[PDB]
Design a protein around this ligand. Structure first.
Ligand SMILES: C[C@@H](CC(=O)O)Sc1ccc(Cl)cc1
Length: 133
């Protein structure tokens, strides 16, 4: 019942600072433009200890499955090959991606009827708000 309030189908409704976040991560111009247009659906499900998070959009479809605290390999939508670990910290899903000596953290939180996604790379944050589909 660890992630009960996260489970479901969620649609992106607002974004702030995402272009700058992608620049900080190292995403190139054309990918930033096309990725920034996308309005993905994020689909979160749980089966036993295994959490699955899918992102589906016109730009890319991604899927990760994982156990909390257990590192895994991920290919991001921008084609980074990263080592990821996802934990629950005080009811917040905290997703750290490591690659090429760099790191970024993505936090996912339930706030009112929204799922808020905060993406941080160095001093640059983007906030992406999802609502139930
Ligand atoms: C958490 C991701 C954003 C989200 O799911 O709303 S971060 C990310 C996504 C796409 C690219 Cl092209 C780069 C980074």
């Amino acid at each position: 019942h660890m992630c009960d309030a996260f489970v479901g189908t969620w649609k992106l409704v607002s974004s702030e600072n995402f272009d700058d976040y992608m620049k900080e991560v190292g995403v190139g111009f054309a990918t930033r433009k096309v990725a920034g247009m996308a309005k993905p659906n994020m689909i979160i499900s749980v089966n036993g200890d295994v959490i699955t998070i899918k992102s589906e959009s016109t730009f890319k479809n991604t899927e990760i499955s994982f156990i909390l605290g257990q590192e895994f390999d991920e290919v991001t939508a921008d084609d980074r090959k990263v080592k990821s670990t996802i934990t629950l910290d005080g009811g917040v899903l905290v997703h750290v991606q490591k690659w090429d000596g760099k790191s970024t953290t993505i936090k996912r939180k339930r706030e009112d009827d929204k799922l808020v996604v905060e993406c941080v790379m160095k001093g640059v944050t983007s906030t992406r708000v999802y609502e139930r589909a």
